Structure 1
Amino acid sequence: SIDWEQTFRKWSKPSSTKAENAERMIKAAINSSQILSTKDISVFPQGSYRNNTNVREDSDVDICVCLNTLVLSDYSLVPGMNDKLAELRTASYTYKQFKSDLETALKNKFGTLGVSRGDKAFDVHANSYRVDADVVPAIQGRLYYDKNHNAFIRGTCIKPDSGGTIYNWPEQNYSNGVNKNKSTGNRFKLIVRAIKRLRNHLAEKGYNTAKPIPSYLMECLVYIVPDQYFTGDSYKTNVENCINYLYNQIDSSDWTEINEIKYLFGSHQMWNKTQVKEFLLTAWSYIQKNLE
Structure 2
Amino acid sequence: NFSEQQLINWSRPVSTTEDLKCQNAITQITAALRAKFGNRVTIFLQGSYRNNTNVRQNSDVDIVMRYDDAFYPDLYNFDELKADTEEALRNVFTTSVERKNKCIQVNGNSNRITADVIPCFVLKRFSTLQSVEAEGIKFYSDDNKEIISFPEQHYSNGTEKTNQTYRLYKRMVRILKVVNYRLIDDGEIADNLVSSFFIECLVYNVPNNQFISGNYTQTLRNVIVKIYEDMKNNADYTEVNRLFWLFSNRSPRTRQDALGFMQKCWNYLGY
Which TM class, normalised by the smaller chain length? Answer: 0.7 to 0.9
Q: How far is the alpha carbon of 1:185 from its aligned partner?
A: 1.9
The residue type paired with residue 89 of structure 2 is L
- Residue 159 of structure 2 is aligned to residue 178 of structure 1: yes
Q: 1:211 to 1:27 in 2, by over 3 A?
A: closer
Q: How does 1:1-292 map to 2 (within 5 A)?
A: 2-15=1-14, 16-17=18-19, 18-33=21-36, 36-37=37-38, 39-69=39-69, 93-111=76-94, 113-127=95-109, 130-144=112-126, 152-208=133-189, 212-250=193-231, 251-288=233-270
Paired residue secondary structure (1:69):
coil
Does the CA contact (< 8 Å) of 2:228 and 2:259 recur in 1? Answer: yes
Q: How far is the alpha carbon of 1:26 from its aligned partner?
A: 1.9
- Report the Cα distance in structure 2 between the residues aligned to 1:98 and 1:66, rounded to whole angstroms: 10
Paired residue secondary structure (2:107):
strand
The residue type paired with residue 258 of structure 1 is V
Q: How far is the alpha carbon of 1:19 from its aligned partner?
A: 4.4
Residues 225-284 of structure 1: per-residue CA shift (max 9 Å, x gap)? 111111232211111101111011123212122112233224432422112111111211
- Report the Cα distance in structure 2 between the residues aligned to 1:11 and 1:239, rounded to whole angstroms: 12
Unaligned regions of 5+ residues in structure 1, if any?
72-92
Does the CA contact (< 8 Å) of 1:266 and 1:272 recur in 2? Answer: no
- Report the Cα distance in structure 2 between the residues aligned to 1:235 and 1:287, rounded to whole angstroms: 13
The residue type paired with residue 101 of structure 2 is D
Paired residue secondary structure (1:208):
coil
Residues 182-216 of structure 1: per-residue CA shift (max 9 Å, x gap)? 11121111111111112222222231267511211
The residue type paired with residue 31 of structure 1 is R
- Larger Rg: 1 or 2? 1
Q: 1:268 to 1:19 in 2, by over 3 A?
A: farther
- Report the Cα distance in structure 1 between the residues aligned to 2:142 and 2:2, rounded to whole angstroms: 48
The residue type paired with residue 7 of structure 1 is Q
**Alpha-carbon RMSD:** 2.1
The residue type paired with residue 69 of structure 1 is D
Q: How far is the alpha carbon of 1:132 from its aligned partner?
A: 0.3
Paired residue secondary structure (1:192):
helix
Paired residue secondary structure (1:13):
coil
Unaligned regions of 5+ residues in structure 2, if any?
none
- Report the Cα distance in structure 2 between the residues aligned to 1:243 and 1:252, rounded to whole angstroms: 16
* TM-score using structure 1 length: 0.81
The residue type paired with residue 4 of structure 2 is E
Residues 137-173 of structure 1: per-residue CA shift (max 9 Å, x gap)? 1111112469xxxx63211111223323221011111
- Report the Cα distance in structure 2 between the residues aligned to 1:220 and 1:23, rounded to whole angstroms: 27
Q: 1:136 to 1:160 in 2, by over 3 A?
A: same
Q: How far is the alpha carbon of 1:128 from its aligned partner?
A: 6.7
The residue type paired with residue 96 of structure 2 is G
Does the CA contact (< 8 Å) of 1:30 and 1:106 recur in 2? Answer: yes
* TM-score using structure 2 length: 0.87
